[PDB]
From a paper:
Norovirus (NoV) is a non-enveloped, positive-stranded RNA virus belonging to the Caliciviridae family. The common capsid structure of 180 copies of the VP1 capsid protein forming a T = 3 icosahedral particle is shared by all identified caliciviruses, which was first reported with HNoV GI.1 virus-like particle (VLP) produced by a baculovirus expression system in 1999. The VP1 protein consists of a shell (S) and protruding (P) domain. Here, using cryo-electron microscopy (cryo-EM), we show that the P domain of MNoV infectious particles reversibly rotates ~70°, in response to aqueous conditions, taking two different conformations; the rising and resting P domain conformations.
Therefore, the VLP of MNoV-S7 was used for the high resolution cryo-EM analysis, and the 3D model was determined at 3.5 Å resolution. Atomic models of the MNoV-S7 VLP capsid were built for the quasi-equivalent A, B, and C monomers of VP1, respectively. For modeling VP1’s A and B monomers, 513 amino acids from Gln19 to Gly531 and 516 amino acids from Ala16 to Gly531 were used, respectively. For modeling VP1’s C monomers, 502 amino acids from Val30 to Gly531 were used. The models were also fitted to the 5.2 and 5.3 Å resolution cryo-EM maps of the MNoV-S7 and MNoV-1 infectious particles with high cross-correlation coefficients of 0.92 and 0.91, respectively, indicating that the structure of MNoV-S7 VLP is highly similar to both the MNoV-S7 and MNoV-1 infectious particles. To understand the capsid structure of the resting P domain conformation, which shows higher levels of infectivity, we investigated the molecular interactions between the P domain dimers of the MNoV-S7 VLP suspended in DMEM. The cryo-EM map of the MNoV-S7 VLP in DMEM revealed several hydrophobic and polar interactions between the neighboring A/B and C/C dimers at the P2 level (yellow in Fig 4). We propose the following chemical interactions between residues on the P domain surface: Asn409, Gly411, Leu412, and Pro415 located on the βF''–βB' loop of the C/C dimer interact with Gln371, Arg373, Val368, and Pro319 located on the βB''–βC'' and βD''–βE'' loops of the A/B dimers, respectively. A new feature found in the structure of MNoV is that the N-terminal arm (NTA) in the A monomer extends to the adjacent A monomer, forming a complex of the fivefold axis. On the other hand, the NTA in the B monomer extends to the adjacent C monomer, forming a complex of the threefold axis, though the NTA in C monomer is more disordered. As a candidate, we found a potential interaction via a metal ion between two carboxylates (Glu223 and Asp231) observed in the folded, flexible hinge of the resting conformation.
Residue numbers in the entry:
A (entry chain C), C (entry chain C): 30 to 531
B (entry chain B): 16 to 271
D (entry chain B): 16 to 136
The structure:
């Protein structure tokens, strides 16, 4: 590889304050990078990204762990590329060594082998040693800011042409193994850092039956998946990123969901009467400016006829405490002008005599629906509205698992006619929006691990748009016991093949 | 260089751990002198554990075996450990990996330390531990140490060890290149010997109720047996997948 | 100091696998221990614990941070004792060096100066160097298990006799500054450990107005403190430890609180009628065995007349969906046999015609009370019951701050007659019971820090029985704006003087 | 000797042509001094041509590629040749042949001279 460096730590050692050794035992293990696990299948046309792995302390667990107490780092990493292919499987693969500040728009096959690359092979026997020496623009990189460093871009080249057996296509699975060289050493030691850009997402050890639902205030009763239900829903509560940035109407509260706070108005009673006008604000004493939330925070996002309690400061025949039914059409039937996007909802009062009600600041908890459908409510007059996007593209063998609760409703036709679905419940939404992790990949592997037996129930990938997918080939419903704590393994890439669910 | 080989004939990747000085520590502790035998040494002998069959139907985050260091890695040392209390440990363990030149795949060993949780050993925990990755196709026996890094002078031979472990994980799962419907489930039998430093510290009488003793089944016949669900002789052992093979029958079952 | 050691790392270096250096820059800073900050006031009779600081990597932030990737440690620490006292303030103080496996039952003044101690003085000018060399019983200590190591016990001796000015008693504030010696080095490097016994409690960056209340399903509206209200209440929801061990009826859910799941029975209608019997179980499909929880998880713990919704599978005149009032006396008035401890509650149905109801598994969300009192409900017939203990002893200048919500109720006498109080809301209960921290002290300092200005609103200590205290000298109510994220500083001891609140 | 090989690991058959002395001829002709880069050299880089997929459905009188010598054999020299007029040529070309030990077959290269008809080869 033509690079020819001379120095990478003695350059920054003057203007560093203090440069710090690590220990001579971390410079001797090849411990694998978090997201460089590739698999060359023979049904892959050549010229695709196998991995794009930067420089940095986020290539070992040890450097990422120790780099939370320093202010930065210099020095050169080293890579052992290993491939799980014996003979009779020809086909090259190139590890190009792309510099910092090279744009990522396109990288075809005539572009890989134009860097100082190494053209290795699937048939190789010994592992492949390769330096990743940081071409700086500055003296030392900082460790709390992601920075344009040297990246290692691997791509197959004269692709894999091998003989495959029955029902098992021979993938050549390759791994990267990073190790800092003798040039790698951190700079000035700053001890207090609690939250870091190299921390791993953790997904706490709360049980999925002990956690609050993120779409309706009920404990989660089921944890199932349906290929017969639509695999691409457009939910607006329980949407989150792993970054912590919320999406849509989602509150960081289990008590705010499917509820709203407003200023009431009780006006009309002239023979048919019985209506109320709620001017929406916010559920923690704030205002309402219509931006991108499509509704105030925690507004009920489903089509039905929701009955809502209320706090009334009624003058005559009772104290300042009586609740009532308050039917409220959330559904597509626009009889009254239902618009939570301007923040004006209308609610029929009660089958009552005439009227005795007083306006004020109210907060309207829900209690029952009449007919549930999993479509979005009309937020503005039937017109469009800035929504959270639908749940993104899956691998075609995967469907999203969902977390069943059960509303209480009025049906008079059949019992338990509906159930409420979400992904990443409110104890994970309030987890992600409070820790605010820094993501590496777009997907994130999990293992569902029950407590008192340790049996791996399923593995599942948690996409960074905040939904958990699961590869179930089938067309029937199936459930899972709700006593397993979710636990991470690694930031797996987008097109990852998690095994199966039987 | 014995057979004709399209396979890696040699793995020696220099596992990075300082050599522990056992058995010069617990010699002043115990009030005895206890050599074992100079012929139990230099004799590679199969452990009563860990016979691992890697399959193509295995995820690469899946464990093949997890051997705790102890005298339950030979018939000899598990036989002598019925007498003694305590031991001080070193082993040479050879994995015997098999499978033709038409297989593929790697597998990592890992000398995981004693005071580490027995929960998640994921795929990404290979750089942290002193490890050796090994090709499945390899022809030689893979010798590797299995030493103890302990805080005491000797590990008591009952449930008091909390000692160092070998974790093997298939790191790249077993894709074959054969153009046939042939089962290439790579069957590997690993086998361990004690080093020139393993010894037992104190000599107690054999009690036969010992942990990791050789389990055995009663040698009668299968038709000389009483059926454990109806009082009748067994008129035939069989298998049938058409019957429901998750039955809920109560009598006749016992944890071993 | 008479100890006379010879070696502390070369003993364990044979049976270690690998011993690991740290770097030569961590062995050069005196960075202060987490809980050794004492203050000798002149009104302190001699013979009291100033600090009892063990050995270990939990004496620096750097050793506690780096010790999450090793399997253990050996070696000797070193202590710089500094005192903030100039001349004219005589009075000695002894740093005794107590061994491992010495019992902590009593330590009088004739016991301190009987160890290999150092008898230093308040009037000293240079700081006080002192070794803390680990007297092992084993080769290396493990780092994931707390272990009996050498402890440094300081105690005053011939006490402080100085001249004090007006209204400021001259405290001699002393600090400890730990630093590992050249003998300190870790052993075998085990990289993956996420949760550690040396991790610091963090208290996430959720706003107190965006968090769900832990006693009633409503968003927190106020954050106030009252010296006129009783400073020692006995709450049963929202009780937690920093350890993660829950106390009483507290669920790890915002939706389970003040609610219960049961098997219903609808039997009696004979002229006055209108009663239902709920046999309690659990709110996530479990049983109920009466142990120490005093009620099922999330049972409403207050005295009143709670009206609760229900899901009814009614045969005639409607579908399997209609909700109703269900008055239920939680209060001390034992008309019907109210007992949630055996799990049998009774609820009057409805001012209804006669009866049409069908039994089944129900879950009874609350909607309104008639008269709120902050006393515990009768859990078993008026008899006693294993309860969570009352909120523990304060420093006499401190009162617990509380988190206001507002129920909706029936009063017909006055509006907003009551408000609901808790400490550590459900997004902190579900935080502590999911992280499950390891505690060092009994108290834990916080700083209330508003977001868009950074103004320190108050400092407050979070006791390890799970309640936040606040030193407000006064007798009037005062509130705080609910937009400040709580942030920790250190594990302060029990008898700590946080400043004031004006 | 990197991988395990039932294949010919080495071809060096000593192509019989006298080495041409370029760039010492056209240095008095042009009125400039023009080095290129010492790092465009010693870096094998894929030509924007000639990616050839041999198949079993090919007659043995069939051509895989016909590369004329020029700066259109690298991205670098085809990028620099947008500026310049003229060049003096030498190349080292590496074919990367692939395929398992289960294939067969040969392929001839041929340094065909410039003034030869572009018809029947």
């Amino acid at each position: 590889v033509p690079i020819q460096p001379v120095a990478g730590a003695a350059l920054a050692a003057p203007a560093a304050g203090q440069i710090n050794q690590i220990d001579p035992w971390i410079f001797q293990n090849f411990v694998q990078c978090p997201l460089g696990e590739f698999s060359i299948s023979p049904r892959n046309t050549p010229g695709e990204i196998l991995f794009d792995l930067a420089l940095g302390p986020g290539l070992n667990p040890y450097l990422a762990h120790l780099s939370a107490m320093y202010t930065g780092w210099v020095g050169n990493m080293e890579v052992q590329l290993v491939l799980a292919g014996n003979a009779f499987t020809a086909g090259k693969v190139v590890v190009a060594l792309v510099p910092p500040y090279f744009p990522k728009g396109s990288l075809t096959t005539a572009q890989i082998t134009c860097f100082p690359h190494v053209m290795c092979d699937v048939r190789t026997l010994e592992p492949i040693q390769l330096p990743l020496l940081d071409v700086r623009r500055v003296l030392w990189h900082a460790t709390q800011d992601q920075e344009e460093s040297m990246r290692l871009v691997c791509m197959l080249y004269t692709p894999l042409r091998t003989n495959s057996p029955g029902d098992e296509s021979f993938v050549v699975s390759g791994r990267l193994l990073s190790k800092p060289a003798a040039d790698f050493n951190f700079v000035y030691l700053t001890p207090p850092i609690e939250r870091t850009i190299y921390r791993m997402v953790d997904l706490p050890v709360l049980q999925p039956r002990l956690c609050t639902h993120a779409r309706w205030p009920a404990p989660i009763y089921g944890l199932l998946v349906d290929p017969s239900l639509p695999s691409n829903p457009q939910w607006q509560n329980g949407r989150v990123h792993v970054d912590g940035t919320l999406l849509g109407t989602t509150p960081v509260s289990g008590s705010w969901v499917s509820c709203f706070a407003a200023e009431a108005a009780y006006e009309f009673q002239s023979g048919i009467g019985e209506v109320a006008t709620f001017t929406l604000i916010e559920q923690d004493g704030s205002a309402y400016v219509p931006g991108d939330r499509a509704a105030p925070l925690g507004y009920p996002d489903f089509s039905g006829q929701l009955e809502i309690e209320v706090q009334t400061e009624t003058t005559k025949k009772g104290e300042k405490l009586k609740v009532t039914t308050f039917e409220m059409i959330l559904g597509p039937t626009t009889n009254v002008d239902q618009v939570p996007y301007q923040g004006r909802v209308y609610a029929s009062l009660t089958a009552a005599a005439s009227l005795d009600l007083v306006d004020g600041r109210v907060r309207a908890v829900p209690r029952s629906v009449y007919g549930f459908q999993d479509v979005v409510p009309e937020y503005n007059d039937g017109l469009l509205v800035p929504l959270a996007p639908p749940i993104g593209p899956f691998l075609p063998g995967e469907v999203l698992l969902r977390f069943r609760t059960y509303m209480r409703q009025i049906d008079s036709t059949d019992a338990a006619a509906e159930a409420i679905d979400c992904a990443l419940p409110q104890e994970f939404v309030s987890w992600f929006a409070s820790n605010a992790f820094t993501v590496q990949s777009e997907a994130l592997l999990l293992r569902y691990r029950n407590t008192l037996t340790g049996q791996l129930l399923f593995e599942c990938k948690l996409y960074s748009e905040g939904y958990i997918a699961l590869s179930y080939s089938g067309s029937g419903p199936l459930t899972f016991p709700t006593d397993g704590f979710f636990e991470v393994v690694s930031w797996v890439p987008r097109l990852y093949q998690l095994a199966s669910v039987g | 260089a014995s057979g004709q080989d399209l396979v890696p004939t040699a793995v020696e990747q220099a596992v990075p751990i300082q050599p522990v000085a056992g058995a010069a520590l617990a010699a002043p502790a115990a009030g005895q002198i206890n050599q074992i035998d100079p012929w139990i040494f230099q004799n590679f002998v199969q452990c009563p554990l860990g016979e691992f069959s890697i399959s193509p139907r295995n995820t690469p985050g899946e464990i093949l075996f997890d051997l705790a260091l102890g005298p339950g890695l030979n018939p000899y040392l598990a036989h002598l450990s019925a007498m003694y209390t305590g031991w001080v440990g070193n082993m040479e363990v050879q994995l015997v990996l098999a499978g033709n030149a038409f297989t593929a795949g790697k597998v990592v060993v890992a000398l995981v330390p004693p005071y580490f949780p027995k929960g998640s050993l994921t795929t990404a925990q290979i750089t942290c531990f002193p490890h050796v990755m090994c090709d499945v196709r390899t022809l030689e026996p893979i010798q590797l140490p299995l030493l103890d890094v302990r805080r005491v002078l000797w590990h008591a031979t009952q449930d008091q060890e909390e000692s160092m472990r070998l974790v093997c994980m298939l790191y790249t799962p077993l894709r074959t290149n054969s153009p046939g419907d042939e089962s290439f489930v790579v069957s590997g039998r690993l086998l361990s010997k004690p080093a020139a430093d393993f010894n037992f510290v104190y000599l107690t009488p054999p009690i036969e109720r010992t942990i990791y003793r050789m389990v055995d089944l009663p040698v009668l016949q299968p038709r000389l047996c009483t059926h454990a669900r109806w009082p009748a002789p067994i008129y035939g052992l069989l298998v049938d997948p058409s019957l429901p093979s998750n039955p809920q029958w109560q009598n006749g079952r016992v944890h071993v």
